[PDB]
Amino acid sequence: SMEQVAMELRLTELTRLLRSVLDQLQDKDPARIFAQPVSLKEVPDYLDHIKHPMDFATMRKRLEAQGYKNLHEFEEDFDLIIDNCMKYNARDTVFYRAAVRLRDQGGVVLRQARREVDSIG
Alpha-carbon span 70 to 47, nearest angstrom: 28
**Which residue, 89, 75, 94, is CA-closest to 33?**
94
Domain 1-121: homologous superfamily in CATH: Bromodomain-like (1.20.920.10)
Q: Which residues contact 81 (CB under 8 A, 6 or more apart)?
A: 34, 54, 55, 56, 59, 99, 102
- Stated in angstroms to one decimal place, the resolution of this structure is 1.7
All structural domains of the chain with their residue ranges = 1-121
29 and 102 Cβ atoms separated by less than 8 Å:
yes
**Which residue, 57, 53, 42, is CA-closest to 88?**
53
DSSP letter at 1? -
